[PDB]
């Protein structure tokens, strides 16, 4: 159970984005149905009134929370990977338009899942804004919680992988457009019951055998990490 509060650009807090530049759902409940339109941008996907201005090479940081800002973020039971996708705003998330910019699943070095790291980072994870065409974008951050992913939703709707999905409206202003954005994948559509990483048992399989759902990270992606960039107590 987790939601995006807002974003930071280059370490500078853009302010509370809920229902403003984030297409926020009414609450922190997971999406589970792989075929639902809810997989795109969660349960209240509509245009919200603002969009965060960035330039290529900027660091764009999502900030998540559980109940209140900078709290425990997400229950530590919710082990799983984190991903960020991008699509042109013109699409409204439809079609084969989602390009992956970041993936983190299990870090063998630290023996930590992405979600575990996210807690330590106070909810913050970032991507470097790529050299795509100027214009309007949706960045879709996705946390997959695996604590009931030993079942499939399609077979048992009380269990299943849980998706915490948040779409931010981002305006890319300055960019040389030297990595024109490719075709991506559809949400719903890319994840199916057979997809690696959707059904997995985190209690018996070793985490080092986890494989995150494809697609793989686009080669034009400029990086990102799960790491606190700013202090919510102070700005
Ligand atoms: O530990 C592994 C074990 O876990 C079992 O599943 C548990 C989860 O571990 C636990 O984290 C989860 O807790 C949920 C709870 O179900 C929700 O009702 C609650 O929703 C809250 C929300 O958190 C608040 O922010 C909001 O204001 O109120 C709503 C209540 O309306 O969210 C918490 C998580 O934060 O519960 C699971 C069981 O239901 C697995 O099933 C088991 O297989 C694993 O082995
Ligand atoms: C999942 O969503 C699909 C497409 O909207 C819908 O037809 C199906 O009823 C859903 N499954 C459940 C259990 O609600
Ligand atoms: Cl739960
Ligand atoms: Cl709010
Ligand atoms: Cl609800
Ligand atoms: Cl659902
Ligand atoms: Cl609205
Ligand atoms: Cl605006
Ligand atoms: Cl708050
Ligand atoms: Cl708390
Ligand atoms: Cl950190
Ligand atoms: Cl349920
Ligand atoms: Cl540039
Ligand atoms: Cl589908
Ligand atoms: Cl992986
Ligand atoms: Cl990858
Ligand atoms: Cl690629
Ligand atoms: Cu939860």
UniProtKB/Swiss-Prot annotation:
Binds 1 copper ion per subunit. The polyphenol cinnamtannin B1 contained in methanolic extract of Cinnamomum cassia (cinnamon) acts as an inhibitor of catalytic activity. One of its GO terms (cellular component) is extracellular region. Lignocellulose is the most abundant polymeric composite on Earth and is a recalcitrant but promising renewable substrate for industrial biotechnology applications. Together with cellobiose dehydrogenases (CDHs) an enzymatic system capable of oxidative cellulose cleavage is formed, which increases the efficiency of cellulases and put LPMOs at focus of biofuel research. GO terms for molecular function: metal ion binding; monooxygenase activity. It catalyses: [(1->4)-beta-D-glucosyl]n+m + reduced acceptor + O2 = 4-dehydro-beta-D-glucosyl-[(1->4)-beta-D-glucosyl]n-1 + [(1->4)-beta-D-glucosyl]m + acceptor + H2O. Cu(2+) binds at residues 1, 78, 164. (1,4-beta-D-glucosyl)n binds at residues 9, 47-48, 58, 67, 129, 140. Glycans are attached at residues 33, 110. Its main location: secreted. PANTHER family: ENDO-BETA-1,4-GLUCANASE D (PTHR33353:SF17), PUTATIVE (AFU_ORTHOLOGUE AFUA_1G12560)-RELATED (PTHR33353). This is AA9 family lytic polysaccharide monooxygenase A. The lineage of its organism: Eukaryota, Fungi, Dikarya, Basidiomycota, Agaricomycotina.
């Amino acid at each position: 159970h987790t939601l995006v509060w807002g974003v930071w650009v280059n370490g500078v807090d853009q302010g509370d984005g809920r229902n403003i530049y984030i297409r926020s759902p009414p609450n922190n409940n997971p999406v589970k149905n792989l075929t639902s339109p809810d997989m795109t941008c969660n349960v209240d996907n509509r245009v919200v009134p603002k969009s965060v201005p960035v330039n290529a090479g900027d660091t764009l940081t999502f900030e998540w929370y559980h109940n209140t800002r900078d709290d425990d973020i997400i229950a530590s039971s919710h082990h799983g990977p984190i991903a960020v996708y991008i699509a042109p705003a013109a699409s409204n998330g439809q079609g084969n338009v989602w390009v992956k910019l970041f993936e983190d699943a299990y870090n063998v070095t630290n023996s930590t899942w992405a979600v575990d790291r996210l807690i330590t980072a106070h909810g913050q994870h970032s991507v470097v804004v790529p050299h795509v065409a100027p214009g309007d974008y949706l960045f879709r951050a996705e946390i997959i919680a695996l604590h009931e992913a030993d079942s499939l939703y399609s077979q048992n709707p009380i269990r299943g992988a849980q998706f915490y999905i948040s779409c931010a409206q981002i305006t890319i202003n300055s960019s040389d457009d030297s990595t024109p954005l490719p075709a991506g994948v559809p949400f719903p559509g890319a994840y199916t019951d057979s997809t690696p990483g959707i059904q997995f048992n985190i209690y018996t399989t070793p985490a080092t055998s986890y494989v995150a759902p494809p697609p793989s990270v686009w080669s034009g992606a400029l990086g990102g990490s799960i790491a606190q960039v700013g202090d919510a107590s102070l700005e």
